[model samples]
Target: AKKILVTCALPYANGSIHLGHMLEHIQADVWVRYQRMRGHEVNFICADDAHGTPIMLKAQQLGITPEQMIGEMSQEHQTDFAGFNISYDNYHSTHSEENRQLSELIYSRLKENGFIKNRTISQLYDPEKGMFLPDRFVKGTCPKCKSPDQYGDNCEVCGATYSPTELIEPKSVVSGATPVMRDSEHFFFDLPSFSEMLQAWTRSGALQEQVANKMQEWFESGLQQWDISRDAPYFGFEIPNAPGKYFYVWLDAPIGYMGSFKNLCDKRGDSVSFDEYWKKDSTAELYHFIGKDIVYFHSLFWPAMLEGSNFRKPSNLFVHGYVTVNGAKMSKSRGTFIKASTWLNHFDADSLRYYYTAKLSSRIDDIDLNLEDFVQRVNADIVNKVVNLASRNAGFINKRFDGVLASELADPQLYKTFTDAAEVIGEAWESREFGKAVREIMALADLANRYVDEQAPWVVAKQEGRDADLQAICSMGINLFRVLMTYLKPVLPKLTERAEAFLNTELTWDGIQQPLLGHKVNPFKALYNRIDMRQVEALVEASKEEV
Candidate 1:
């Protein structure tokens, strides 16, 4: 079997997990599960991005140390992820001892290679708080558009880009004190030095086309020197040899992937070295899944870092667009920014998996989850069509057919349909066309329902001496259910268990192509029922009750 390494962007440990976070995690989890079911040796790794100044400030607000805060948040994150059925192989933190060693090695290599330099820069500092304020720690009116309550980087209200010091009357969020201009020595990475190499690798198709275009545009416009270090009172792995300074969060976020791999090896008592996966090219392929907001950091700086440090670059870079609620950006006042934990209280996590798969595709188009559309699509696609196929037919077979399938199917067309659906669905998943895969698998359900309508199994069973024909139709139904279950195992593995019990057969990719006849059938029940509208409303309402 082929070996692959997969990673999702590590989420920050400073906030709660919301619907937007679910979109990315579920996407990677679904793809990883599909690859595993297809018999591949794959390692799916992720971690909590437990660095940056935001975490330090949040810890202070809660009256605890940053380490204690991240410990509690990481535990809560794991529990919430379990509710969504996202089975991560290993989730490590960037603050681990392994990460500390790796960061030191990377910094040393970059410094020796003339990639790092110290530069004096002016930054915002609060005298009252006696500390330097990170960009997110300060907010003010936009200097260009006069928009109020905008961040230091950009004005979300008017879409104007400016520096933090350019803001009008900027004040520190922590101390509410007017910040003063102060000079500090910070470490910088010379991004312009690697521009030519990055351009060549990007044009050679080492990255995705959309991502390549975005990075090419950014670099062509102008490459700026990246400040790779921060001042004191930061909550990250401190820089060795440079006292009172730490590596920026973005610099260490990607390293968490490597740290998680090391953690996995240590737990297994294996001597697998990180060099094989990170520096060697002939052994494994790495794929990264990230949102579009951070395209510049991953496609440009990340690859440059790897090339300069002699680590293998990623084989494929996957970028996804943002998620919108009711055709608009998620908002708390609109009651659309539902928390992941809140959604778990109303329905099964598989429902959201199915919904996201139905909406997401291979492109970088934004996915919208309109409330009415969510209900209509899921009810019509899953509850009514997919689940209804097994619910109505299984009970009928159990009650009338003595829980036994036919000895053989008379119609060969039924077999052809099952095999064709399975093949197309697998191909779609392999290509990362999740929406297409869901559509193709749902077509099988449509076929089963149409078959039932044409044959009128209820009418045929009533006829005298027509038991053979009834058994033939019922056998076709069971076979179709089995095929659907095989394709759905990636999205909803628990549902596959219920299907295996009802059909009394083991699931496999090969079994999907053949029909099972003359087999003993188990008792059946509703696979999924229609969701109540009030339940959804309650979920939305509960999310508004802030903790």
Candidate 2:
């Protein structure tokens, strides 16, 4: 069995988990589940990136401590994940003692190796707030493209990165007051020092081809020292030697991965060792699933931080694009930014999960959550195609011939067709090409339905002296239904479980090759219901409220 470790991009604690964020989790979760079914030992972990200017500022606005704010947010985050059945082995936090220890250790190592330099940097400062204004705190015209209303660090319109002082006319987002030039000393990680190493790693196929091509631009432009420290008003671990200076959120955030694994190892009580997976050079395969926005962070800075600190770098980074709604980016102003909880309240989580599996691929392309397409997609695939197979076949198996599936295969050649399809389906699933798998499974389901339509088993049951033929025909459908469910187990697990109970057999890849015969299945339960249009309307209306 291969040892695998998977992680989703740590979601910021500033907001609730939205559909956009759910894409990352669902994508990673599906792959992990597939690996587990294949008998590989896979560990899936994610944490709340519970530190940043937003968290601190939000806490101030809420009239609570940052600890209390995150404490409350954790419970809500866990509830939302549970609502969607996200199986995180350990849903941890960046504020844990394990993170503090690792961050300090890494920082000290970087400092010792002369890769950390102290530099005085100028930034936009708000006098009224008495704090340095970072990205999104100050907005003005872009320095590169001269676009208006851009954040300090990057221009959304021109996609350019620049210093706050470069803005044409900067205003603090905090109080709408003008920001002035101010200078302060912060510890900087010498990211440029790892330029050669990063360039080699980028081309090593750890990244997608398009992603690596995008990195080529950054390499040509050159790298810079990354600021690793934030001043006193921060809610994070304090840098060891620098009084009133704390490790910046990004510095500690990635370390939370190791911290999470360490937490899990500790809980397992010596059954597993953290050092085995993270010992600078290890065989354990690591995969990170993140959105395309943080490519530089994951590909460059993340590896540099780990390499410098004698920790194992990631084996691969799977980047995905943002989630858009109706072909446009989800926006609160546009009433398209839907939350996970809002979806769970009105719809089945598996529907979205199935829809996403049908949509998601290895390419870093944005997946659109078009409500109209979503309704048709789920209804057609899960309800009509997948669950419909079980619904139709289960009826005959349960009522006709006393729930006993015929002991022998009616069409052995057709059964081979389903088993033969698994070769491609298994390859697609193994390669994280879930979209291909979904398509193939849907095609097989269609073929099965067509076979049933042609046979007309109900008509056979009505004729005299056709009892065995009817049982055999319906049993063919039941076995075909089982094979489809087995293929779909990783994508739609809940449905797979219900199908297993209905068929009185465990759903497995191997189980597909064997015909379930003479099986006395339980009474057929309604596996799925048609989604109501009003539920979509209710979810959209509910999402209009700001959290």
Candidate 3:
């Protein structure tokens, strides 16, 4: 089996986990679980992105050090993820000793390769705070378009891009003090020199088509040397031999992958070097799952950094669109903004898992989860169609039929249909077309429902002469439920367990293809209940209250 290393974009530790955060984590978690069930050697790793000015400011407001703030936040994050049933093999912090060591090693490698240079640049400096402000720490009017309330990096209103120094009347967000221009020496990574390498790697099909096109277009226009170091009062790994200076969060963020690998090595009691996983060719496949907003960082700068340091570039980069509630960006005022904990308060974790897989496409299009639509979809798909079949039919065999398996399947057409659906669903999952996989699996449910209605199993159960027919119908229903459960294990794990319990069989992918003969049937219960409009309204009201 091939080894797979899956990672999600690290969540910033400044705030609680929201729906946007869940979108990325849930996507990666579902894929990792699926790969495990497919019998692959896989490890899923992620960590909290604890470095940046936002965290520093948040910590200051709470009257605590940054380390203390992140420790508390990390505990909350882990507890919330556990409630959502997200199973990660390893969850570490970016502030660990392993990360610091790897950051230093990579920084030294880049410096030795002539990729690092120091230059003095004028930046916004807050005199009251006696420190330089990072771009995100300053906000003012846009220099190009004269739009007010613009961020330092770009104008959200007019779509104009400029540096912090170009902003008119820039003020520090930290202390609300006017900042003056001050010159400071900062390290820059020579990205322009690696333009050719980046372009070649991107066009070589290592990246998605849309990502590759966007990157090529940007490089063709012109590349800028990325500032890789920050001046004093920054929260990150300090630069070597450069006192009071730290590497920018973006510069050291990708190195978290290596840090995580080292942590894993130490935990497993292995002497294998980090190079075996990161630098060696073909030993492990690296896949990064990120949102579309950070494409440039991963597709361009991250690859360039890896190539410069002789590390293996990522095998694939998967990008997904952002999340919206009720066809608009989540707004706190309209009550659409929901925390992960709040959502878990109303619905089961598996419902979200199934709904996300049903709607997620392998493209760059955004996904919307209207509250009413979410409730309806789950109730109809899981309760009415999928779970209802097992709950209604499994009880009859367990109570009246002496828990005996029916005769061998005599209907050739039904057997062929089952085999065909299994093949298509399996292929869809392997290709990561989760939407298609769900649609194909649900076809089994539709067939079972039609079968039950046509067989009139309830009517036959009341008659004496219909014993054999009753047995056949009940057997076919159980077999169909078994097949549905096998295909759904990836999306709905908890509900799958219910199918296993009812059929008295071990949960395995192989059980779907074969019949269960002479096995005892267990008592049945409702796996899920339909969510009505009142519950939906209550959840919407509660989510609004959270904001």
Candidate 4:
């Protein structure tokens, strides 16, 4: 078995865990679970991005310590992830000692290798707040289109790139004070130096096609030196010798992955595994699951930083698109931008998990929630197609046959049909073709439902002397349910647990070869129930009121 380490993008500490964040986590979680089923050693790791100006200002506004603010958000983040069944081996914070030490170590190595450059440049300063303003903290009319209220170094309306100081009538977003230009000596990483190496990696076919194309565009634009240091009045790790300068948030955020894994190792007292996975010549595989928005960071800067620090870079980068609701971006006024905690109050976690899995694929295509479609699809697939297999057959097994399955298979050929599909379905899961895998599973579900309809179990129940035939038909359907549930075990966790309890056996990929024969099973009320549009309406209305 191979050792693998997988990570999702670190969730920012200032925001709540929303469906947009849930998409990436669930996608990665599904793959991790499948890898474990195939007997691979996988470490799924993540942490809160607990540094930066916004987090610092948020804590100041709340009258809490930065440490206290990050702690509460970290707990809440972990709680919400747990509610959604995100199987992270360790959840940590970027503000911890582990992150600080590693960030400093990496920076030192880059400096020693002459990859670090120091220069002075003019930046916008918020005089009222007594600190230099990051590009995002300054807002003004766009220099190109004269569009008002544009923040950051680029104009959204005109798609023009310029310095924040180039905007007309620039003002500080924090204190609304007029800003002025100031000079500071900042440390820069020579990103342009590694352009050829990065290009080689991009052309190696390890990244997605769309992402490789995007990287090509970036290379055409020409790489510049990356500013890695920020001025004082920031809440982050200070440079080892520079007293008034701190590492920029972007510089240390990806290192949080390493920091989180190190923290896990430290806690578990496993000392050798971390180096075995991160050493330059090690054979362990590493992958990062990230959204398309951060492709520039993960695909380019991250790998460059690791290479500069004499560490092993990622084996691959799995990129996915954003989550849209009803075919558009999530709107708070429309209440389609739902938070993870809010979703649990409205519906079970598996419903969303299954819906997202059904829509997900290996490409970076955006997945739509499409509230109406979500309601219809979940009910039809989970309630009617799959779970109906068990709900329709279990009654006969409990009432007449003393919860014991038939002595032998009613249709061994049909059983083989399901068992034979394990290879293709397993390959789909391994390749991250989630949408294809779901389609295959649902096709099997349809065939199982058809088998029950052909036997007419409900019709056989009313006959005078067909008890043996009825038991055999229901047992066949239940066994078919067993096979379908094993294929779906990774996509639907809670439902799989219920199926296991009723089947009196654990679901495994290979276990489908041996159907339950003469084995006693338990009775269940309902494995899954239907959802209505009224619940969807309520959820939307509740979300609207929350904001």
Candidate 5:
């Protein structure tokens, strides 16, 4: 057994949850649930990244204050995550006092160690807005690749790092005005100071192999000092003794992980010791689920800062790919850029959750939400294969057998097959290889369905004086379904709830080892319906937001 702490990347408080956001949360939630089922003590936590120029500017555009905007956005975020069964022990905010206090503590430590430095740097300032712009606020051609529509920090096209001034004809994305260069004394983190340590960490199996290879490019090029402070007019914690400066959102965002856990500790009231999970050389395992775009942040800066501040670095980082719609990037004009609210309006969350899990792997490949494929996959696997087992068996158990399953398995060898398969599924789930686990479970589901077809239990019910044989066969099918549901408990939680009621037992890993016998079960109702393409069409239509 392991004591584990897990976190998904903080969602920026400026937007809504889309299918893209669901990928990371669903993946993390599945892994966390698996650990809990295996009897590990797990604390899963996340937070809203509520600071930065984008939040402040978006609030201004919406005629509200930053605090009010984040307050509303956080509520929506929680609702969406919960709808998909993302079980977070604590889903707090980065704007909390805990985050600010922890950020200050870490920053102070880094300063004492000479990792914080004062440097005069030039930044692009929008005169009309009367505020300094973050790297994302300016767009122009990349200096190295000369690619059009690049951000101030780096080129997405060629992945080149260059200052905003290096771009030709740079303009503010906020007001479309030409930004002027202004000088400010910014705080810098001596990122290069931890070059040796970070290089070792990156290569030490902390990140995915591909991400580590990408990080190697930076190491081959050179490490640079990272800016840790943003100029004033920022919606964030003010830096102590430094007027007109605030901790950069990145600096505070990852700190939110610790803050979230600290909040959980305070809420639980001494049930947990915070240091036992965060102190250097602590026994607890830590993992982070993030997207591919942010590999640089998690693999390098995050661990370096944690080690520098006497905190335990993460054990591993699971990086995922982007979400596309119908084989392309989501586009507003195409009506593929759907929001969570819109999806909830038209379809059940489990359908989407199951579809993602069936396709997700321990890799960084992008997931395509193909509407036709989604409808067929959900209907075929979840509706016809898994739930159909209960629908076929429970009717006889409830009506013919007095809600009681047979005392002994009709096919003891078959029961052994399922129990043996459970171990492989558990291993896949533990390694974050959900795609493999789902495949194995569905194959078992197929075999159970095939057995029902071969047994002809409903036909047996029609013959006189064969009721005993019919009872045994249907009971065998029901117990087989109980095993399948136990394997799927981590992914489709709502289905597991219905399965628990239907089986009249706690669905667990150990429960799979023992065949449920002589236990009464409730009549199974509808678990899931087959998906219709019209629902998918309606979702796309509703997703078309008025610009």
Candidate 6:
């Protein structure tokens, strides 16, 4: 079996877990689960990006220590992910000792190898806050249109881009004081030195085409040394031998993946596993699931960091686009920006997971959570189409046949058609073509439903002396459900649990070939219920109130 290591982008500690975050975690979790089903040794790892200027500022605003703030946020983050059934082997924090040591080790290796450079750079500094101001932390009138309160280097109103230093009368958003340009010695990763290596890896077909194209654009523009050090008063791992400087959040953020895995290894008492997986010559496959916005960091800086540190680089980078709602970016005023915690109070995690899987594909296309369409799609596909197989047949088996399935197949040819599609469906999932997999599964669901409708089980039950025919028909439907649920085990985990209990057997990739004949399944209530727009409206209303 192939050994695999997968990671999702570390969630920023300052923000709440939202639907946008869920999209990536669910996508990664689905693939990870499928790999486990295929009997691969997979370690799914993630952590909270807990060290940053934002976290420090947020803690100050909350009147708590940064440690306290991050601790609380980490727990909340883990809870939300667990509620959605995200199977992270070890969820950790970037501020842990594991990260501190790894960050130092990597920085030291890069420095010894002459890949780390130090130079004094000027940045806008907040005099009152006594901190360097990132572009987003400064606000002023647009230099182009004279529009006021334009944050960052770009003017939202005038559509003009310029350095924050060019803003007219720039003021620190944190302390409301006029900022001045100040110089500080900062460490930089020699990214340009590795541009040739990155270019070769980018063209090696390991990344999505769109991601590769984006990398080409960056290459055409030429790479620069990435600043890896932040000034004092930042909340991050302190630079070795540099008391007043700290590693930039981006520098340690990706290392959190390694830190998290190390933590897992320690907890499991597997010392050799860590080195076996991360050593330069190791054969373990590594994959990172990240948003399109962070492609530059993952594709360029991250791999370079590992290569420079004598660790194995990533095998592939799976990038996905932003999550939109109803054809637009999630908006607080419109209440489309839904949080993951808020989602649980309204609907089961399976509904959103299924919907996202239906819209997702191998490409980095933005997925829209159309609430109207979501309501109809879940009800039709999961309720009427998929769950229909079990719910419609389970009642007859429980009431009439003492919960026992038929001893023989009612239609062997129809069952073969369902099993035969497994190869293509498995390939679709393995290739990250989630939408294609869902489509193919739903087509099989449709055919299964057609078989049930043709049998007319209800009519057979009412007619006299047709008990055997009724049992055979309903049992066929239940067996069909077993096949479909086996296919969807990775996507709908919670539902799969209930299905396993009812089917009295574990669903596996190869087990479908031998149908569950002469098996007795337990009685179950509605396997899945229909969802309505009223629930959607209530969820939206709640989201608006939350903001």
State the lDDT of candidate 2 residue by residue for 311-404, as single tens digits. 8899999989889898998878666898888888888778999988898888998898888888888888788877776677667666777889
- Comparing 1 with 5 on TM-score, the higher-scoring candidate is 1
Which ten-residue region of model 1 has the weakest summed lDDT?
273-282
Among all candidates shown, the one with the greatest TM-score: 6
TM-score attained by model 2: 0.93
Q: Residue by residue across 337-394, what tens digits does model 1's lDDT show?
A: 8888888888788888888888888888898887777777879987887777777666
Which one wins on lDDT?
6
lDDT of 1: 0.83
> How many pairs collide in each candidate, listed in order?
0, 0, 0, 0, 0, 0
Candidate 1's displacement at residue 55, Å, is 0.7
Runs of candidate 6 with Cα error greater than 4 angstroms are: none
lDDT of 5 by residue, 82-153 (tens): 888899999999999889899999999988888899999877899987788878899898888889888778
Give lDDT tens digits, candidate 4, residues 1-547.
9999999999999999999999999999999999988889999999999998889999999999999999999999999999999999999889989999999999999999999999999888998999999889999999999999999889888899898988999999999999999999999999888999999999999788999999999999999889999888999999988989999999999999999999999999999999999999889999999999999989888899999999999999999999999999999999998999999999999999999999998899999999999999999999999999999989999999999999988889888898999999999999999999999999999898888889999999999999999999999999999998888888899999999999999988778888999999998978898999999999999999999
Ranking by lDDT: 6, 4, 5, 2, 1, 3
What TM-score should be assigned to candidate 4?
0.96
RMSD of 5: 3.1
Runs in model 2 with CA error above 4 Å? 139-180, 545-547
Q: For model 4, what is the alpha-carbon lDDT of residue 214?
A: 96
**Candidate 3 — number of clashing residue pairs?**
0
- lDDT (C-alpha, whole model) for all candidates: 0.83, 0.86, 0.81, 0.93, 0.89, 0.94
lDDT of 6 at 527: 74
lDDT of 2 at 345: 81
**Root-mean-square deviation (CA) per prediction:** 2.3, 2.9, 2.5, 1.9, 3.1, 1.3
- Please provide, for model 6 over 394-446, each residue's C-alpha lDDT reduced to its tens digit, 9 standing for 90 to 100: 88899999999899999999999999999999999999999999999999999
Q: Which stretches of candidate 5 lie over 4 Å from their true place?
A: 127-129, 135-179, 545-547
